[PDB]
């Protein structure tokens, strides 16, 4: 919006075509990661870590 447009203008941030959906740890709960699994649809290229 107008005032939002000015806000990016002063502080010079490029507002992304992408929004953050990232999975983050629930509030207050804290622990150690003992494992990670990666499932992929058949045909999408598996990324590096996976």
Q: Whole-number minimum distance, CB 22 to other proteins, in Å?
A: 19
Site for other proteins, residues 1 to 50, rule: CB under 8 A: 10-13, 28-29, 32-34
Distance CA 40, CA 47 (A): 9
Distance CA 7, CA 17 (A): 17
Select 21 or 37, whichever has its Cβ closest to other proteins.
37
Q: Whole-number minimum distance, CB 2 to other proteins, in Å?
A: 19
Do 43 and 33 contact (CB within 8 A), yes or no? no
Q: Which residues lie near other proteins (CB under 8 A)?
A: 10-13, 28-29, 32-34
């Amino acid at each position: 919006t107008p005032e939002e447009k000015l806000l990016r203008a002063i502080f010079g941030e490029k507002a992304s075509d992408v929004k953050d959906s990232s999975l983050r740890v629930p509030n207050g709960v804290s622990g150690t990661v003992i494992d990670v699994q990666v499932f992929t649809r058949d045909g999408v290229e598996k990324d590096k870590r996976a």
